Structure formats: C-alpha cells, structure tokens
C-alpha cells in the first residue's frame, strides 16, 4: 500500500467515503453471503477453523463507531471477509465465487476512494 493509505489518519470526511463504499458492497447482488456473520449451523467447524471472522454488519458497526484510524485497517477487515471465505469454501462453491466477484468490486471502489482522498 501507498503511504497515505498506511499513514494518514482517517478524518470525518474520509468516513463519509467509507460509509459510501460499505453501502455499495451491501447493495451488491453478490454480497449476500457476507451481510451478516456466518451462521454456525450453515457452516460446520467454521468458528473452530476461522480465527478472525468478519462480515459487513460488523464493519458497519465499526465504521459508525469510528473504530478505524487508518485506511489500511478498514481494508484489512474487508480483506478478511474474502480471505476467510476462500479459505473455508471450495473454489467451485458459490460462496467462493461471491468472494472473487465482490473483492474485485471492492478494489474498484477502494481505488475510487483513494483517488478522491488525494484530491
């Protein structure tokens, strides 16, 4: 990551942009597996094998409460969503495919956000 992403404290203005990014992901058709925490009754051994679960509702709470100090930390939580999903699910699963699609969408939005921050 670039130095602004790593070092620049997130401001209130930055948080408006973070909320916009999160809302765009929540609204995406392929976000359905990531909207809320993984249900243990749907996913055998999940919480036994996934050390740091994450989901979009948890990130929404963190954005509201100003949890993140640096953009890198917001990106790290988001990246957990996708990495956890690819870790636990087979590559031919619809879940895995959702992670591939939504991650690409997130990267597009994130670049947009970083650009906007820079001007």
Numbering used by the authors: 2793 to 2911
Give me lines lifted from the publication on this model.
Bromodomains (BRDs) are protein interaction modules that specifically recognize ε-N-lysine acetylation motifs, a key event in the reading process of epigenetic marks. The 61 BRDs in the human genome cluster into eight families based on structure/sequence similarity. Despite large sequence variations, all BRD modules share a conserved fold that comprises a left-handed bundle of four α helices (αZ, αA, αB, αC), linked by loop regions of variable length (ZA and BC loops), which line the Kac binding site and determine binding specificity. The four helices form a deep cavity that is extended by the two loop regions (ZA and BC loops), creating a largely hydrophobic Kac binding pocket.
